[PDB]
Design a protein around this ligand. Structure first.
Ligand SMILES: [Cl-]
Ligand SMILES: [Cl-]
Ligand SMILES: [Cl-]
Ligand SMILES: [Cl-]
Ligand SMILES: [Cl-]
Ligand SMILES: [Cl-]
Ligand SMILES: [Cl-]
Ligand SMILES: [Cl-]
Ligand SMILES: [Cl-]
Ligand SMILES: [Cl-]
Ligand SMILES: [Cl-]
Ligand SMILES: [Cl-]
Ligand code: NA
Lengths: 178, 178, 178, 178
């Protein structure tokens, strides 16, 4: 029985380019997490309490997704390499601009997963594509949700009354089309 | 004991013009159903989640009404003839325009029932007028409900804030005067 | 942030040939639904109450599958296009012939999903293959179920006693090998 | 305040031809009741216990329908006139022949109600047509049920095994398409 790079028994070797891509994706999810924290703070500073609570939860959930990936590398007997984390964006001129960045961040997270997926396919790493399948499904739902929140905020057209109504929706947990 | 056109024992023959009118009405209700599905999609595309949920339920209910009619033809030992279904209207410039089409669709459904009713009276088919009586009563309530939703949306006068408030009413199930 | 063809924020553009294939598949599932409705009526006309109840439920379930696809197009910011629905087949000389058509309809539904799947793979649309994976799994179970019902009816070899026994099985909800 | 023919206060006089038609209809329902009793006995004599239980209940229900009509005449301050009751048919060569007579009896009961209904319409007696409306609706369901039982028995094609299976269905209360 062979030993993998992290010292555990190795079921199947992993291509180093694929390993590097997964470690980079962990950084992307950690960066999404701190970005959602920054967004939660921006909303709290403007008394948008429902948006603050929503993004606080998204920050925690994105970190969990990142840790889920570190557990996969452990399971594959591959080394983890936690990287320097860039500072997030922290300034927006409007809630609509913030929500556009949030949607972009979610789509970019999926794009990173897709790039890992394609590299796994090139290397015939079926464990990795199977591992990623439910995470892509969750990203479809998250993209649908962030398009809903962004579209509702854009519909408000900067009216504070409409934004207070949506803020109260989010505080109540009404965050998707349902 | 005589056999009816669908092969079952026949309690009382039905005039072929009346049979054709009932088969056409089934098509009208099936068309109302797919129209409400189209409306649910239009609302979902604009993040009007409460209207999306309302019309999704109306689509399912209208299909049930259609099947209720197919069961009556079975009970009368008459043949069913499921017809080609036209594609629904799918484009509107405003929610107010959509709700006007929805109200028109409900009134047109009643008008079709009324035309069947009058033909049953001409043929002295008391089973059919009795069968239709509670369906007309339900249509009165549905017309009252759709006039309420259309009138509330028109009262909003295109203000997004007002439309978000009404959208949340519908998501909560507040869909009638009560 | 770009806008998709249905107006919502766009996470990733979709190839128009793939979009057309998904819209066509929605029509296939809607056609399966009305076909199962036609089958439910045919069975009801012959007092096969368990088969009537089974196909009535299959009609409702197939419509739900169709709506599930419309929701995916919404989530991908793609336009829906609800199409004209052909009239279903409505006449069979025997229950065994009906069940053969039902099995064929289920296999043809899977074949349509497979064709969408292959087109998604050609375009590297991993969101769509992930979305389709559980629907293919459900189709495997449905094909297994319809092969069971068709095989049991063929085993009956046209004996009315055997068909009454199977009819009572279906009324009781005994519709699979288990 | 005027007194009606039975001595009670009279809300609205009733045409004597209509009164005679209602008294005759009470006899028809009483005759249906004793006919169903005769059928229950015929089935019991042949150990068709489920059919015996079904027709025993139909006999009791038909008598209740008859009494319902006597209560309407009381409510309209009209005289009741309970008539001589003919002896029922009591001999059949097969269960299929019995079920045909049962279906005919149900259709003939509806026909009698229809004749009362038309006479009420000619006399503009809206109380009577309103009273009859739910009874016609129940007759539609009863005709549907008796067509189901007759059709299932005919499907059996005289096979004792099939008739025992249907007999057990009826004993269990499985008496309609559902
Ligand atoms: Cl900005
Ligand atoms: Cl804004
Ligand atoms: Cl940015
Ligand atoms: Cl318009
Ligand atoms: Cl509007
Ligand atoms: Cl229109
Ligand atoms: Cl055939
Ligand atoms: Cl067969
Ligand atoms: Cl076919
Ligand atoms: Cl006889
Ligand atoms: Cl027989
Ligand atoms: Cl007779
Ligand atoms: Na049995």
């Amino acid at each position: 029985v062979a030993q993998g790079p992290n010292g555990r028994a190795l079921a199947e070797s992993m291509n180093p380019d694929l390993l590097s891509a997964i470690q980079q994706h962990i950084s992307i999810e950690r960066y999404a997490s701190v970005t959602y924290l920054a967004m939660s703070i921006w909303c709290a500073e403007r008394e948008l309490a429902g948006f603050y609570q929503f993004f606080d939860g998204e920050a925690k959930d994105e970190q969990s997704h990142a840790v889920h990936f570190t557990q996969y590398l452990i399971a594959r007997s591959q080394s983890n390499d936690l990287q320097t984390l860039d500072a997030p964006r922290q300034n927006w001129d409007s809630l609509a601009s913030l929500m556009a960045t949030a949607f972009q961040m979610e789509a970019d997270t999926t794009s990173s997963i897709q790039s890992v997926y394609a590299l796994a396919e090139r290397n015939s790493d079926t464990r990795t594509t199977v591992f990623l399948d439910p995470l892509i499904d969750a990203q479809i739902q998250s993209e649908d949700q962030f398009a809903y929140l962004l579209g509702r905020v854009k519909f408000a057209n900067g009216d504070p009354t409409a934004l207070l109504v949506i803020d109260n929706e989010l505080r109540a947990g009404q965050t998707q089309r349902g």
